[PDB]
Amino acid sequence: SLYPPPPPYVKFFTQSNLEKLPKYKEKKAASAKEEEITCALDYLIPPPMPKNQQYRAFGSIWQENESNYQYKIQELRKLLKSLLLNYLELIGVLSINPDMYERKVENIRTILVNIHHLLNEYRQSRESLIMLLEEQLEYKRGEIREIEQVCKQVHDKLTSIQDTLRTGS
Amino acid sequence: GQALDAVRMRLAQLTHSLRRIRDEMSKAELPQWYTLQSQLNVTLSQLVSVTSTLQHFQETLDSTVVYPLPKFPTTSHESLVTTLLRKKNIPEVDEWMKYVRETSGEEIEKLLQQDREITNWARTTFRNEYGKHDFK
Amino acid sequence: KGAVGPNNFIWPAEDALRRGMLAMASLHSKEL
Amino acid sequence: MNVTPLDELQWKSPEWIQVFGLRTENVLDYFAESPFFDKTSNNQVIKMQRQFSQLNPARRQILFKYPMYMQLEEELMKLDGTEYVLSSVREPDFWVIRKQRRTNNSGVGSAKGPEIIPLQDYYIIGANIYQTIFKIVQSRLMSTSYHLNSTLESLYDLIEFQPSQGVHY
Amino acid sequence: MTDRLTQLQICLDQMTEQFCATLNYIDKNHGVPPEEFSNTIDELSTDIILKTRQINKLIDSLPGVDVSAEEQLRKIDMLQKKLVEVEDEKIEAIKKKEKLLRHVDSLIEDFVDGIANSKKST
Amino acid sequence: PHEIYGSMPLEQLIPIILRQRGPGFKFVDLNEKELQNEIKQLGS
Amino acid sequence: PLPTRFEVELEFIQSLANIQYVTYLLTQQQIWKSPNFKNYLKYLEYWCNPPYSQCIVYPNCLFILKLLNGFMESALEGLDELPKIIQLQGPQWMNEMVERWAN
Amino acid sequence: PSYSPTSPSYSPTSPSYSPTSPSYS
Amino acid sequence: GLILQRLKDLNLTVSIKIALMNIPKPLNSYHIKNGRIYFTVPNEFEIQLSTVNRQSPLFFVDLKLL
Amino acid sequence: EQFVKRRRDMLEHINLAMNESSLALEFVSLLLSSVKESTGMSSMSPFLRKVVKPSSLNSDKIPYVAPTKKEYIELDILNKGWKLQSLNESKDLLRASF
C-alpha cells in the first residue's frame, strides 16, 4: 500500500508488559551478571549505541569555548586571477579554433570546482554565532542604557520638584 | 435536464426543511412536543418524496456524463473539486452493515420461496381475519 | 516547484520512504 | 474477495513524474502502466506496430494544436474498437482523456461515419487519476437517514408521558 | 541585516549569470554593426571588472577573515562571561531601582494620608 | 511561569482574575487579609 | 543487510511528521483502539533528549508525537480537524521549536 | 419571488474517505 | 502576585479621587480597604465603590441594606 | 448533565447528517444555472457564486450497460437481506416500545 505497515514489535507490548518491565529488567540484569530476541520484553530495554558510532541510511553514511587563513586568502585571490586569465584564453580559443574549445572548458570548471573545495574548509556556523552574539548583546545594551537614562531623568525631575516645593515653603 | 431540475428543486426544499428543523432545534428551550412531531413528519415524508422521485428518473441521471468547465480553474479550486468528487460512505455505516451481515450470516432459493409462501399465507390470513368482523 | 529535486524537501518525501529499506524490511518482516 | 471500486481508484507514480514529468506529450505514456489501461485496446496494438516498424468547443482546438494527435487518428481510423483518446487539456496541471469505443459501421445505407460511444470518465488531476453521482446522492441521503434515525430514537428515549399533562421532557 | 556570506553567494551567482549573458550575447551577435557591438561589449567588460572588484572587496571583508578561529573561541567565551556579570549587575540595578521606587511609593502614601486627614480635620 | 503574570498589564490581568474567580465575583471583592490567607495555605 | 531497530524506529519517528500518514493511521479503528500503538508512542517519548535528538532529520515530528501524546487525553474525534489545525498552528509551533533549540 | 435562499452549509472540515492503495509500482 | 500592589494602587487612586471631591459632612464616615471605599450611613445603607482609572469616574461596586 | 450530553450528541449528529446533504444540492443546482442563468443565480451559495461563473452542469449521453443474470439477482437477494434486517430491528424496536 501507500503507507507501510506499522512495525511488528509495536503490537507485542501491552499495559501488562509495561508494568512488568521493571521486574523483567531486574531479572535480566541479575542474569547478565546483536542482542538475541529470546523474550517478547527485550525491545523495551534501550538499544545499545553501535561501537562504530555510524549510521547508514538511503546509501549515505553519518556519524568548545562557543558552547594560516592568509594562505587560503591568497590562494583564492590567485585562483580568481587564474580563472579570469583562463576565461580570456578560452574565449580566445572560441575566437580562433573553437572546434577544440571544450578541451579548456571543463578545465576552467575544475578551478571553479576547486573554489567550492576552498569554501568547504572555510565553512561559518561560528561566524553566525558571532553575529547573533553581537546583535543581542547590542540590543540588551540599548535596553539597559535607556533604562538608566529614564530612571535618571525621573530622579532629576523628582529633585527639581523637591527644590521647587522647598522654595515655596 | 428536466429530471435533474426537478431533483434540484425538491432537494433544495428538503435542505430548506432541514435548515428549518435545525434552527428550531438549536434553541436553548425545547418547543412543544406536537410542533416537533409535525416538523418530523413533514420533513420525513418529504424525504420519502425525495427517494421516490430519485427512483423515478434514474435513467436521466445515469445518462448524464460529468465534466469540469473549461472556464472553471482546477489549479485554484482543486480542493473544492475533490470535495464534491469523493463519494465513499462514512465509515460507521460501513462497519454497521458489516456487523449486520455478520449477524445475519438451491437451499437459499428454496428458503426464499418458503418466505414467499409464508408472506402470501399471512396476507390471506389477515384478509380473512379482517373480513370476519364487520368494521363498518 | 515543478522540478522535483531529490533529497531536499521541507517534509519527508513519500518516494523517500518508498525507496527506504523500511519498505522491504516490512515486506521481509517474516525473515526478521 | 473484496475489491475497491475502480471509480474511486487513484494511482500515483512518483518515479514516472520524477523521471519524465507531467506533460501532454507523455500523458498517454503516463496512463499506459495504469490498471485502467486495458491491454486489449487497439492503442497497445498500435504501440507494438510502431515498435516493430521502428525496429525493422476545445475538441477542435486540441485537434489542430498537436500533430501527434493527428497521427493518432490516422493510426486509429483503421482499427475499430475500444480506444483511448484525449478529451481536453489545460496546462500545467489539468488533463482529461475521453474514454470512447468506435464501431466503424461501413454498411450500405448509413451516411454517418464511425460510431463513437462513451464508456467511462477519467480525470488526471496533478499526478493522480480519478474515475456515479446517483450513488453519491443515495449514499449521502442514506447516511443522513441513519443519523436522523439515531437522533429520533434518542429523542423518543428522552420523551416521558403522564396522563394528566400529556408528553413532557 | 544581510550576512556577508549570503552577499558573497549572491555576488558569485550574479557573476556567473553575467558571464553566461555576456557569452550568450557574443554567440548570438557575432557576425549587428561592429561599432554598437564593440560598445556593448566594452560595457559588458566594464561590468565584468566591476563585479570582480566587488568580489575582491567582499572576500577580504569577511570579521575573522584573517583571524584564527581559536582566538574567536576565547573571545566568545569571555563574552559570555562578561555577559553573565552584566545581567548580574542589571539584577542589582533593577532591585535597587525597585527599592527606591517603593520608597517613593511609601512617601506618596504618607503624603496622601496627610492631605486626606488635614483637609478632613476641619 | 510567573513571567507571563508579571509581564501583563492590568487591563488584561483584570479579565484573567475575573475568569479565574468565576462569574459574579468582582475583581475587587478580594480581601487583603483573605489574600494573604490563601497565600499562606498555598505556601504550605 | 537487515536494518537494525534503531533505523526503523528513527524512520517511523521521522515519518510521523507527515499529516497524510497521521490521517491514514487514525483512519483505521484498530490502530487507535489497540493499546499497543499508544504504548509504543509513549515509549518513543525518550528521543527528545541528546544524543538521540542529534540523529533526527525533521524536528517537527518531535512536537507531533507530543501532540499525539495529548491525543490520548483529548478523546477518533478531532481527526477531521487535524490538517486544518496543523496548518493553522504551524507558525507558533515552529516558533516554540526554534525557541527550544535555536536559543 | 424566492422567499429565502439557502444558507451555505459547506463542510470543508470533512476529512473525506478516499481509499488510496495503488501507489506501489 | 501583582494583585497586592494593584489593590494598593487602587486604594491610593480612590483616596486621591475622593480628596478631589468635597464629600458631604453626613458622608464623613468612610473606609478604605482592598481597592474599595466603604460609606456606611447607619440604619440607612453601606455602599462600596471603586474606580478603574484616576481620570475615569467612580462606578458602583456593591451595596448592603441596614 | 446526561440530558445536556444527549442533546449535544443529537445536535452534532444532525449537523453531520445535513453536511453531506448540502453537497447534493450544491452539485444539482448547476444544471438550471447553465440552462437559465437568472433562475440559477439564487440557487447556489454566495461562496460558490464567487468561485466561478455557473455554467457547470451540461447534458450528456451514455449508454446503459448490457444486463445479465450476474448483478440483478444478487442486488435483489441482498435487498431482501437488508429488508430482513429492517424487519429484525422493526420487531426489536416495537418490542422495546411495548
**HEC sequence for J24-70:** HHHHHCHHHHHHCHHHHHCCCCHHHHHHCCCCCCCCCCCCCCCCCHH
- From chain G residues 22-81, the ones with a CB under 8 A of any chain A CB are 24-25, 31, 34-37, 39-40, 43, 46, 55
Cβ neighbour number for residue G87 with a 10 Å cutoff: 10
Please indicate whether, in this complex, the C-beta atoms of H17 and B89 are within 8 angstroms of each other.
yes
Which residue in H has a C-alpha nearest to residue C18's C-alpha?
H24
Chains G/H: 3 or more C-beta pairs closer than 8 A?
Answer: yes
Q: Please give the Cα distance from B32 to B18 (Å, whole number).
A: 18
What are the grid coordinates assigned to J64, written together? 446503459
Give the resolution value in Å: 4.3
By three-state DSSP, how is residue I50 classified?
Answer: strand
Q: Please give the Cα distance from D109 to B126 (Å, whole number).
A: 62
Please indicate whether, in this complex, the C-beta atoms of I36 and F28 are within 8 angstroms of each other.
yes
What are the grid coordinates assigned to A168, written together? 515655596
Q: Please give the Cα distance from D62 to D57 (Å, whole number).
A: 9
3-state secondary structure D33-90: CCCCCCCCCHHHHHHHHHHHHHHCCHHHHHHHHCHHHHHHHHHHCCCCCEEEEEEEEE
Chains A/E: 3 or more C-beta pairs closer than 8 A?
Answer: yes
Within 13 Å, how many C-alpha atoms sit on residue D159's CB side? 17
Pair D139, B87: CB distance under 8 Å: yes
CA distance J59 to chain H (A): 25
Burial degree of D143 (CB within 10 A; 0-12, 13-18, 19+)? buried
Considering only CA atoms, which of G41, G35, G32 is closest in space to residue G13? G41
Which residue in J has a C-alpha nearest to residue D100's C-alpha?
J62
Phi, psi of E29 (to 5 degrees): -120, -15
Q: Please give the Cα distance from B86 to H16 (Å, whole number).
A: 7
What are the grid coordinates assigned to D138, written together? 443515495
Q: What are the beta bridge partners of residue D128? A: D125
Q: What are the beta bridge partners of residue D86? A: D97
Please indicate whether, in this complex, the C-beta atoms of E93 and A148 are within 8 angstroms of each other.
yes
Q: Please give the Cα distance from C11 to G14 (Å, whole number).
A: 9
What are the grid coordinates assigned to E45, written together? 567588460
Please indicate whether, in this complex, the C-beta atoms of J14 and D143 are within 8 angstroms of each other.
no
Phi, psi of A52 (to 5 degrees): -75, -10
H24 in contact with chain G, both atoms CB, cutoff 8 A: no
Q: Please give the Cα distance from E116 to I15 (Å, whole number).
A: 8
Pair I49, I36: CB distance under 8 Å: yes
D4 in contact with chain H, both atoms CB, cutoff 8 A: yes
Pair I62, I35: CB distance under 8 Å: no
Q: Which are the residues after which chain I is interrupted (C to N > 2.5 Å)?
A: none
What are the grid coordinates assigned to A116, written together? 567550492
By three-state DSSP, how is residue G6 classified?
Answer: helix
Element housing E115 (H / E): helix E69-119
- C-alpha B28: how far from chain center: 30
Q: Please give the Cα distance from A104 to A96 (Å, whole number).
A: 14
Phi, psi of D98 (to 5 degrees): -115, 115
- C-alpha D15: how far from chain center: 22
Element housing A154 (H / E): helix A125-167
Within 13 Å, how many C-alpha atoms sit on residue A8's CB side? 12
Pair A126, A66: CB distance under 8 Å: yes
- Residues whose CB falls within 8 Å of the CB of residue D112, separated by 6 or more in sequence, listed in order: D105
Pair F28, I50: CB distance under 8 Å: yes
Q: How does strand D82-90 pair with strand I36-41?
A: unpaired
Within 13 Å, how many C-alpha atoms sit on residue F31's CB side? 4
Phi, psi of F32 (to 5 degrees): -65, -45
J23 in contact with chain B, both atoms CB, cutoff 8 A: yes
- Residues whose CB falls within 8 Å of the CB of residue A155, separated by 6 or more in sequence, listed in order: none
What are the grid coordinates assigned to D73, written together? 487518428
What are the grid coordinates assigned to E14, written together? 550574479
Crossing angle between the packed helical segments E34-59 and E4-29, to the nearest 10 degrees:
160
CA distance D122 to chain H (A): 16
Please indicate whether, in this complex, the C-beta atoms of A57 and C20 are within 8 angstroms of each other.
yes
Q: What are the beta bridge partners of residue I32? A: I37
Q: Please give the Cα distance from E37 to E17 (Å, whole number).
A: 20
Cβ neighbour number for residue J25 with a 10 Å cutoff: 23
Q: Please give the Cα distance from B108 to B125 (Å, whole number).
A: 25
Please indicate whether, in this complex, the C-beta atoms of H6 and B79 are within 8 angstroms of each other.
no
What are the grid coordinates assigned to B63, written together? 445518462
What one-character DSSP code corresponds to residue D161? E
Considering only CA atoms, which of G101, G6, G103, G102 is closest in space to residue G50? G101
Q: Please give the Cα distance from J45 to H9 (Å, whole number).
A: 8
Q: Please give the Cα distance from A21 to A15 (Å, whole number).
A: 10
Buried b (16+ CB within 10 A) or exposed e, E97-119: eeeeeeeeeeeeeeebeeebeee
Q: Please give the Cα distance from A26 to A13 (Å, whole number).
A: 18
What are the grid coordinates assigned to D114, written together? 464511425
Which of chain G's residues have a Cβ under 8 Å away from the Cβ of C25?
2-3, 8
Please indicate whether, in this complex, the C-beta atoms of J31 and B14 are within 8 angstroms of each other.
no
Q: Write down the experimental method used for this entry.
A: cryo-EM
Pair B10, B55: CB distance under 8 Å: no
What are the grid coordinates assigned to A139, written together? 540590543
Within 13 Å, how many C-alpha atoms sit on residue A84's CB side? 14
Contacts 24+ apart (CB under 8 A), A98-103: none
Which residue in A has a C-alpha nearest to residue G52's C-alpha?
A49
The residue whose grid cell reads 437568472 is J38
Which of chain H's residues have a Cβ under 8 Å away from the Cβ of G84?
12-13
Size of interface B-H (CB pairs under 8 A): 23
Q: Please give the Cα distance from B8 to D133 (Å, whole number).
A: 13
Which residue in C has a C-alpha nearest to residue H25's C-alpha?
C18
Element housing D95 (H / E): strand D94-103
Chains G/C: 3 or more C-beta pairs closer than 8 A?
Answer: yes
Residue D63 identity (one-letter amino acid): L
By three-state DSSP, how is residue J98 classified?
Answer: coil
CA distance G28 to chain C (A): 19
Element housing C18 (H / E): helix C14-19
Crossing angle between the packed helical segments J2-28 and D133-158, to the nearest 10 degrees:
160
Q: SS3 helix, strand, coil % of chain G, rounded to 5? A: 70, 0, 30
Nearest to B30 among D8, D166, D169 (CB): D169
What are the grid coordinates assigned to A150, written together? 529614564
Cβ neighbour number for residue H9 with a 10 Å cutoff: 19
Nearest to B91 among H4, H17, H18 (CB): H17
The per-residue DSSP string of E50-67 comes to HHHHHHHHHHTT---SSS
Q: Please give the Cα distance from A85 to A83 (Å, whole number).
A: 5
G12 in contact with chain A, both atoms CB, cutoff 8 A: yes
CA distance H19 to chain G (A): 10
Pair J29, J43: CB distance under 8 Å: yes
Nearest to D147 among J14, J24, J93 (CB): J14
Chains I/H: 3 or more C-beta pairs closer than 8 A?
Answer: no
Residue B121 identity (one-letter amino acid): W
Which of chain G's residues have a Cβ under 8 Å away from the Cβ of C22?
3, 7-8, 11-12
- Residues whose CB falls within 8 Å of the CB of residue A151, separated by 6 or more in sequence, listed in order: E97
Crossing angle between the packed helical segments I3-20 and E69-119, to the nearest 10 degrees:
40
By three-state DSSP, how is residue B57 classified?
Answer: coil
Nearest to E109 among I12, I19, I28 (CB): I12
Q: Cα(first)–Cα(last) distance of chain D, in Å? A: 49
Which of chain G's residues have a Cβ under 8 Å away from the Cβ of H23?
none
Q: Cα(first)–Cα(last) distance of chain J, in Å? A: 27
Q: Which CA distances in Å does B59 have to B3, D115, D154, G40?
A: 9, 22, 38, 53
Residue A46 identity (one-letter amino acid): P
Considering only CA atoms, which of E53, E44, E54 is closest in space to residue E21? E44
Crossing angle between the packed helical segments F32-43 and I3-20, to the nearest 10 degrees:
170
Which residue in I has a C-alpha nearest to residue E113's C-alpha?
I15
Q: How does strand D128-130 pair with strand D94-103?
A: unpaired
Pair A119, A72: CB distance under 8 Å: no
Cβ neighbour number for residue I32 with a 10 Å cutoff: 16
- CA diameter of chain I: 38
Pair B84, D130: CB distance under 8 Å: no
What one-character DSSP code corresponds to residue G52? G
Burial degree of J32 (CB within 10 A; 0-12, 13-18, 19+)? buried
F32 in contact with chain I, both atoms CB, cutoff 8 A: yes
- C-alpha J49: how far from chain center: 22
Residue E31 identity (one-letter amino acid): G
By three-state DSSP, how is residue I32 classified?
Answer: strand
- Residues whose CB falls within 8 Å of the CB of residue D60, separated by 6 or more in sequence, listed in order: none
E strands, B1-136, where? none
Sheet with D128-130, edge to edge strand ranges: D82-90, D94-103, D115-125, D128-130
- Residues whose CB falls within 8 Å of the CB of residue G79, separated by 6 or more in sequence, listed in order: G23, G26, G27, H15
Touching F (3+ Cβ pairs <8 A), the chains are I
Pair B60, J31: CB distance under 8 Å: no
What are the grid coordinates assigned to D102, written together? 468506435
Cβ neighbour number for residue D51 with a 10 Å cutoff: 10
Considering only CA atoms, which of H18, J64, G21 is closest in space to residue D4? H18
Considering only CA atoms, which of G44, G102, G101 is closest in space to residue G72? G44
3-state secondary structure A104-118: HHHHHHHHHHHHHHH
Please indicate whether, in this complex, the C-beta atoms of D11 and H22 are within 8 angstroms of each other.
yes
Touching J (3+ Cβ pairs <8 A), the chains are B, D, H
Cβ neighbour number for residue G9 with a 10 Å cutoff: 20
Please indicate whether, in this complex, the C-beta atoms of G80 and H17 are within 8 angstroms of each other.
no
Which of chain H's residues have a Cβ under 8 Å away from the Cβ of B90?
17
Q: What are the beta bridge partners of residue D161? A: D167
Within 13 Å, how many C-alpha atoms sit on residue D86's CB side? 28
Pair G32, G26: CB distance under 8 Å: yes
Q: Taking CA G79 as the corner, what is the angle to CA G77 and CA G82, rounded to the nearest 5 degrees?
A: 130
Quick one: how many helices (H) and strands (E) in chain I?
Answer: 1, 4
Q: Please give the Cα distance from A89 to A83 (Å, whole number).
A: 10
H23 in contact with chain B, both atoms CB, cutoff 8 A: no
Element housing D160 (H / E): strand D160-162
Cβ neighbour number for residue A17 with a 10 Å cutoff: 16
Q: What is the dihedral of CA E67, E69, E75, E80, to 10 degrees?
A: 140
Crossing angle between the packed helical segments G5-15 and G60-70, to the nearest 10 degrees:
80
Q: Which CA distances in Å does A160 have to A156, A163, E104?
A: 6, 5, 15
Q: Please give the Cα distance from A158 to E108 (Å, whole number).
A: 12
B90 in contact with chain D, both atoms CB, cutoff 8 A: yes
Which of chain F's residues have a Cβ under 8 Å away from the Cβ of I10?
28
Pair D100, D42: CB distance under 8 Å: no
Q: What are the beta bridge partners of residue D83? A: D100
The per-residue DSSP string of D10-27 comes to ----HHHHHHT-S-SSSH
Which residue in H has a C-alpha nearest to residue A3's C-alpha?
H21
What are the grid coordinates assigned to B117, written together? 409462501
J6 in contact with chain D, both atoms CB, cutoff 8 A: yes
What one-character DSSP code corresponds to residue G3? P
What are the grid coordinates assigned to H7, written together? 444558507
E strands, G1-103, where? none
What one-character DSSP code corresponds to residue I48? E
Chains E/J: 3 or more C-beta pairs closer than 8 A?
Answer: no
The residue whose grid cell reads 453531520 is J16
Sign of CA dihedral E74, E76, E80, E86: positive
Q: Please give the Cα distance from I64 to I32 (Å, whole number).
A: 16
C2 in contact with chain G, both atoms CB, cutoff 8 A: no
Q: What is the dihedral of CA B87, B90, B93, B94, to 10 degrees?
A: 70
Element housing I46 (H / E): strand I45-50
Q: Please give the Cα distance from A128 to A126 (Å, whole number).
A: 5
Cβ neighbour number for residue G36 with a 10 Å cutoff: 19
Pair D36, D5: CB distance under 8 Å: no
By three-state DSSP, how is residue A123 classified?
Answer: coil
Which of chain E's residues have a Cβ under 8 Å away from the Cβ of A71?
none
What are the grid coordinates assigned to H13, written together? 472540515
Pair A46, A15: CB distance under 8 Å: no
What are the grid coordinates assigned to C14, written together? 513519500
Please indicate whether, in this complex, the C-beta atoms of I19 and E109 are within 8 angstroms of each other.
no
F18 in contact with chain I, both atoms CB, cutoff 8 A: no
Residue D76 identity (one-letter amino acid): L
Nearest to C15 among D18, D21, D92 (CB): D18
- Residues whose CB falls within 8 Å of the CB of residue A72, separated by 6 or more in sequence, listed in order: A118, A121, A122
